Amino acid sequence: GDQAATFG
Amino acid sequence: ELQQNFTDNNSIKYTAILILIAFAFSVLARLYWVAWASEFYEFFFNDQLMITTNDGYAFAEGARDMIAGFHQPNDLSYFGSSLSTLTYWLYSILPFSFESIILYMSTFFASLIVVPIILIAREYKLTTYGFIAALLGSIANSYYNRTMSGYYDTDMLVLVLPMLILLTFIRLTINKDIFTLLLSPVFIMIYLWWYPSSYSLNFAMIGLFGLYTLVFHRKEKIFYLTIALMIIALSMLAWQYKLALIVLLFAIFAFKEEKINFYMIWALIFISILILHLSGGLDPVLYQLKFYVFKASDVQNLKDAAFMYFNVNETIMEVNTIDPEVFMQRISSSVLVFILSFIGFILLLKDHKSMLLALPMLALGFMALRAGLRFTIYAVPVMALGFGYFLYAFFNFLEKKQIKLSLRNKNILLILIAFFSISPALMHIYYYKSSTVFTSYEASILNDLKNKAQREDYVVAWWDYGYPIRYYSDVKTLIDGGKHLGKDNFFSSFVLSKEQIPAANMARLSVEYTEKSFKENYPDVLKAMVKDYQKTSAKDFLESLNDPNFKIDTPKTRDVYIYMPYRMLRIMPVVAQFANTNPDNGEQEKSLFFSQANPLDQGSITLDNGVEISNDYRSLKIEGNSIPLKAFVDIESITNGKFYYNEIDSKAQIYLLYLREYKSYVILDESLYNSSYIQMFLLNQYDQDLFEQITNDTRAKIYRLK
Ligand SMILES: CC(=O)N[C@H]1[C@@H](OP(=O)(O)OP(=O)(O)OC/C=C(/C)CC/C=C(/C)CC/C=C(/C)CCC=C(C)C)O[C@H](CO)[C@@H](O)[C@@H]1O
Ligand SMILES: [Mn+2]
Ligand SMILES: [Mn+2]
Ligand code: NA
């Protein structure tokens, strides 16, 4: 949830 | 022991004991994950657990480089940053390993939030309710998430400082404490030094402190003076100018009773607003709003000075939206406690007008509903006080309605209420079995890269990995956690998702032009590439990149590595989407069929995403629709490139990949199958004239240009 990473 | 009265007690000894109990509770509570994670070899490196957000490695690199005393020119090292600097001081002062310090700092400082919560509650003579509120606020879902052990990031003090500023305003409203004239500004400075984005909150809070003062203290000089000092503290004056002004006006107001004439202080307010204006004032607020609240794509405001790029905002986990249940649990670990917390906040407001000054943080947290979950943080402690107030209210009812309750039994009732309502946060902690950023194996691969490559080299990767690679490998990256706009991401997207001839042309051209742009400041690097090789559009240049007879007039200044880890597989479509966007256009080019899923058991295979794999291994079933496969590729060695290409249908277009070494399936289209990633990683097929294999592992491959 609280990550400065990619998703989708 | 329990028959006694705790509610009326507000002594300094009692409040110190309560602060100690709550702080120890906060630390203890964020110790469970350490206990859990320590039992998995996968989470260690250098004999310690690893950091737990991507961004911590940015400050971790910065801390390391401050310890070492240097970085390279234009690796974008957080050298001198606040969290890096505090890490460096603590490292130089303490006996514990670097990794242990970086693991536990958040666990310590985020727990300081307990202090202002129960001191604010105490200013209202509610210290015990403050104690309960601090227990809730210290471990509430979203606040825990960004401050657990290993969350080595700037969140760990990002509400403590604003809550201390709030406490400062309260003490001013109740006791007219002259020491506010000093602390309000100093804290703003610390906040601005620790988290420059805090500017926006500061601007809002200071702004409100003025309007509040125009209403409730329209005649008290001390409020106007402290406003001038705080606006100065918001400005860009050098630290010595700021502190000089603050101490000067502080002494003159503290020790003069003829004091400062009112006209002089309105003059000071004007001088202040001028200084803050010169410092850029309000612009950072509108920019942050532009990115998070209005989610604009072109945020730098360059029409035709740049190309058009995919918008990264809808791609970051922190900024993803959230439904009301999750909003409320993020804030209060439970809907019930959230409702009661909100009631409590209303009642507290309509009893202590000064709690009005908490509205900015509250507002910021609620702004999460538009701006992404990462903002709910700001509503946790405010709302926690609200819940505290609700409890004070409730038992108050029970006496203003003459309910016969012992002290021992009222206290048993309070302990039970607080424990039962704090339960959801503990459950969340227990279930929030978060894992390390990377696995020991990946950190090991990147450290071996460190000992193999040079400090001035680049590794092209996706931006998710920029901070860990620069930490573990001590190299340069094209994009990272804070440099990840569309215009930035395009190059790594292209290198990783296009075919190899143009992927290597783009890896060389992008690394070289980035390095040049450090000396030349191109508003758009792709546009610089275009307008150098005398091309008319982005599409024109990129398609001209397809030539095996391509002249390379930019000389080679370093090696260029490409990092291709297994964990990128599942975000390949998202990575691909960036170079799938016509820079002349903003327009999407191909459709991108992709997903990775795990077989369930062992007659019709189902996979997580409901995709039925044919018994035949010849068709899929998405949403009730059966779609034919072009080929079933059964891959037994990612490193050996030993796989079995089973022809099915030359006329069809979808590929099914089986990863034996992971027991996983991939469903993709022709365009993604030929991408540099799927080919060089999964199938181990690379043009040996274009790349050299540097590291070959089932979990990751590192290639070098030549
Ligand atoms: C190691 C690393 O890479 N870290 C990266 C990461 O860190 P970061 O999150 O901390 O930085 P940020 O995203 O810019 O913070 C903005 C978050 C705010 C709460 C502050 C401002 C947000 C607003 C929406 C303004 C609201 C305005 C007000 C006046 C408050 C009142 C509002 C009401 C009442 C509705 O992200 C950055 C991405 O660029 C990187 O630069 C940075 O490097
Ligand atoms: Mn962060
Ligand atoms: Mn470096
Ligand atoms: Na294990």
Side-chain angles (χ1 to χ4, degrees):
Chain A
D2 311 75
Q3 244 78 218
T6 288
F7 85 100
Chain B
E1 301 173 28
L2 260 180
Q3 164 82 309
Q4 42 189 6
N5 187 301
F6 297 86
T7 281
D8 294 356
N9 191 341
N10 295 284
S11 54
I12 55 281
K13 204 155 291 173
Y14 177 73
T15 305
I17 304 191
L18 287 196
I19 269 132
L20 285 168
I21 298 159
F23 181 82
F25 171 88
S26 181
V27 171
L28 249 310
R30 40 208 86 183
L31 248 29
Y32 161 76
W33 179 88
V34 179
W36 173 73
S38 276
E39 89 142 9
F40 303 110
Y41 73 81
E42 289 90 332
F43 295 151
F44 283 78
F45 192 84
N46 263 338
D47 311 347
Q48 182 56 282
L49 295 162
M50 297 162 72
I51 256 5
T52 246
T53 338
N54 295 70
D55 281 306
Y57 285 105
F59 307 103
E61 165 182 25
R64 131 184 134 200
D65 289 338
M66 290 181 75
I67 301 179
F70 65 98
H71 63 103
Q72 277 68 52
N74 301 309
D75 55 12
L76 315 154
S77 176
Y78 278 50
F79 192 118
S81 77
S82 69
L83 175 50
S84 298
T85 296
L86 182 58
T87 312
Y88 162 83
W89 295 342
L90 285 171
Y91 177 90
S92 310
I93 264 162
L94 293 182
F96 315 116
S97 72
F98 186 85
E99 287 84 13
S100 315
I101 290 190
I102 264 201
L103 178 73
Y104 286 116
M105 286 182 55
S106 52
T107 298
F108 182 90
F109 288 94
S111 302
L112 266 12
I113 227 285
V114 125
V115 163
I117 293 182
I118 87 193
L119 291 190
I120 287 176
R122 183 195 186 260
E123 289 291 335
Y124 299 141
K125 291 167 65 178
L126 305 178
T127 305
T128 303
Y129 300 94
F131 178 73
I132 283 96
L135 296 171
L136 176 63
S138 78
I139 70 170
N141 280 28
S142 66
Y143 189 70
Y144 174 81
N145 286 352
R146 334 188 115 241
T147 49
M148 44 146 173
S149 304
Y151 209 102
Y152 175 69
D153 202 354
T154 234
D155 302 64
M156 67 178 89
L157 285 172
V158 89
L159 298 182
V160 160
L161 296 174
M163 287 297 285
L164 288 185
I165 295 184
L166 186 60
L167 169 63
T168 265
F169 296 171
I170 306 294
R171 306 200 94 246
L172 190 62
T173 307
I174 291 180
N175 321 304
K176 275 74 214 181
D177 178 20
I178 299 172
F179 280 141
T180 284
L181 237 196
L182 215 274
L183 289 191
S184 214
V186 157
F187 281 145
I188 288 176
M189 289 178 82
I190 295 170
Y191 198 6
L192 229 53
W193 161 84
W194 205 68
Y195 182 57
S197 293
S198 78
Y199 185 90
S200 291
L201 228 199
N202 290 132
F203 192 110
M205 277 184 57
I206 303 186
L208 200 69
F209 189 91
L211 289 181
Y212 186 93
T213 293
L214 288 186
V215 164
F216 298 97
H217 306 270
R218 203 178 322 116
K219 58 283 135 182
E220 268 152 305
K221 298 148 84 184
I222 200 175
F223 288 75
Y224 292 100
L225 219 194
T226 185
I227 281 176
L229 282 201
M230 286 191 306
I231 295 189
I232 287 188
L234 193 51
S235 76
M236 299 219 85
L237 264 351
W239 69 263
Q240 26 232 340
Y241 293 143
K242 294 197 179 193
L243 219 122
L245 268 334
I246 295 157
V247 178
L248 219 150
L249 284 134
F250 174 75
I252 259 80
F253 182 102
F255 296 91
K256 186 125 184 170
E257 73 274 17
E258 284 184 353
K259 287 184 164 179
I260 313 94
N261 157 273
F262 243 119
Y263 305 84
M264 210 261 141
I265 65 90
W266 275 113
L268 264 139
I269 282 187
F270 184 82
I271 292 189
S272 240
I273 293 171
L274 216 168
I275 287 189
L276 180 72
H277 167 82
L278 291 198
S279 294
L282 206 33
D283 289 31
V285 194
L286 307 182
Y287 178 93
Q288 291 288 354
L289 288 170
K290 203 179 182 177
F291 185 87
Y292 285 105
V293 167
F294 302 92
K295 281 127 123 55
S297 258
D298 192 24
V299 200
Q300 308 168 283
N301 203 46
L302 336 136
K303 285 171 172 176
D304 213 30
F307 288 117
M308 293 175 65
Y309 301 86
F310 195 74
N311 186 353
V312 85
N313 183 278
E314 344 285 342
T315 276
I316 305 165
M317 300 173 65
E318 280 179 342
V319 183
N320 192 359
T321 53
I322 253 335
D323 56 298
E325 183 162 7
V326 165
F327 174 82
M328 294 187 293
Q329 295 149 348
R330 286 210 114 216
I331 296 176
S332 302
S333 298
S334 99
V335 177
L336 217 202
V337 171
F338 178 93
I339 291 147
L340 296 176
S341 284
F342 198 82
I343 298 162
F345 176 85
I346 301 301
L347 296 177
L348 174 60
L349 227 49
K350 303 293 130 53
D351 288 320
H352 299 276
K353 319 87 204 290
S354 63
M355 205 42 46
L356 225 48
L357 298 173
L359 281 180
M361 294 176 83
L362 219 249
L364 238 186
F366 281 64
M367 194 202 66
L369 291 177
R370 178 63 219 253
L373 55 291
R374 83 104 54 134
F375 293 106
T376 61
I377 241 47
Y378 287 81
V380 164
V382 163
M383 283 267 125
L385 284 163
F387 186 69
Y389 201 77
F390 186 83
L391 295 188
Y392 164 71
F394 176 69
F395 286 90
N396 201 265
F397 198 65
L398 292 184
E399 299 165 45
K400 208 177 304 165
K401 319 257 67 175
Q402 284 162 237
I403 267 59
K404 289 184 175 168
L405 256 196
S406 328
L407 278 218
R408 188 175 200 176
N409 289 144
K410 163 183 187 182
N411 280 7
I412 292 194
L413 229 210
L414 248 186
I415 291 162
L416 293 189
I417 292 160
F419 158 72
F420 188 42
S421 50
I422 231 196
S423 282
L426 293 176
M427 282 295 226
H428 177 75
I429 288 167
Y430 175 90
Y431 285 107
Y432 201 81
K433 285 166 204 305
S434 146
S435 89
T436 301
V437 186
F438 288 168
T439 62
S440 316
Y441 214 115
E442 292 165 284
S444 293
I445 286 162
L446 286 167
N447 191 94
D448 165 85
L449 212 208
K450 170 150 76 45
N451 300 113
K452 281 169 169 216
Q454 299 303 310
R455 259 21 75 209
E456 202 53 79
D457 285 342
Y458 274 73
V459 1
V460 182
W462 198 229
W463 65 261
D464 293 26
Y465 315 132
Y467 293 146
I469 292 173
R470 289 216 305 281
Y471 172 71
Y472 283 115
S473 290
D474 193 349
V475 296
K476 284 182 173 184
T477 54
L478 289 179
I479 53 186
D480 52 51
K483 177 183 188 171
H484 60 203
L485 303 183
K487 80 211 284 291
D488 295 324
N489 296 345
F490 179 90
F491 310 106
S492 299
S493 192
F494 195 104
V495 174
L496 286 160
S497 65
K498 300 304 200 183
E499 285 169 37
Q500 307 188 20
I501 306 86
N505 290 318
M506 251 286 52
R508 185 53 65 174
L509 282 185
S510 69
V511 159
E512 293 307 340
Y513 266 75
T514 294
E515 211 48 48
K516 293 177 67 84
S517 192
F518 288 111
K519 338 284 173 170
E520 217 88 37
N521 315 101
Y522 310 129
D524 188 314
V525 170
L526 182 69
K527 210 120 187 188
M529 299 200 317
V530 166
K531 310 296 189 277
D532 255 359
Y533 281 85
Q534 344 236 343
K535 276 2 205 298
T536 49
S537 86
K539 284 301 288 189
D540 183 17
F541 163 87
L542 299 166
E543 265 272 303
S544 84
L545 288 187
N546 269 249
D547 200 10
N549 276 17
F550 187 67
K551 65 285 169 191
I552 355 163
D553 295 82
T554 330
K556 283 80 188 189
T557 40
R558 41 190 55 77
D559 289 314
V560 168
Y561 300 83
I562 307 162
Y563 174 73
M564 304 183 18
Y566 162 82
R567 70 160 77 246
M568 215 194 72
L569 231 206
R570 66 147 228 289
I571 57 159
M572 252 284 304
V574 182
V575 187
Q577 193 52 228
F578 286 83
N580 201 36
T581 310
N582 179 2
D584 299 310
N585 237 351
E587 174 173 82
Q588 190 180 350
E589 290 179 352
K590 326 178 172 207
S591 235
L592 300 193
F593 199 95
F594 188 108
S595 80
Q596 163 175 38
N598 303 343
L600 265 317
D601 32 37
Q602 321 263 237
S604 16
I605 325 291
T606 285
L607 307 197
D608 312 307
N609 51 14
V611 169
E612 261 82 337
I613 291 188
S614 199
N615 261 70
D616 224 12
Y617 269 79
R618 295 189 136 254
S619 63
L620 306 184
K621 184 169 184 175
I622 303 104
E623 308 273 349
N625 292 315
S626 120
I627 113 180
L629 292 179
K630 183 211 243 311
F632 171 56
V633 193
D634 171 37
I635 303 177
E636 65 173 313
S637 187
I638 281 151
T639 44
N640 288 356
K642 196 116 83 291
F643 64 87
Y644 306 94
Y645 186 103
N646 305 107
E647 245 241 313
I648 306 196
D649 209 335
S650 56
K651 305 193 268 45
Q653 28 271 338
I654 299 298
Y655 294 73
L656 183 55
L657 311 186
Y658 187 56
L659 275 52
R660 288 197 211 167
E661 294 154 301
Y662 290 92
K663 197 194 190 175
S664 200
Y665 295 92
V666 178
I667 304 179
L668 29 39
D669 53 32
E670 263 258 7
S671 198
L672 288 168
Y673 186 78
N674 297 310
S675 54
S676 278
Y677 176 79
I678 295 285
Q679 297 284 315
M680 300 167 60
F681 181 68
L682 277 183
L683 304 172
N684 201 48
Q685 310 287 279
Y686 59 95
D687 189 350
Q688 309 215 333
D689 292 320
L690 286 187
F691 321 92
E692 164 178 46
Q693 200 171 62
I694 303 280
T695 305
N696 182 8
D697 194 84
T698 313
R699 305 152 193 87
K701 283 180 198 169
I702 310 172
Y703 292 92
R704 212 194 81 254
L705 288 196
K706 194 42 165 320

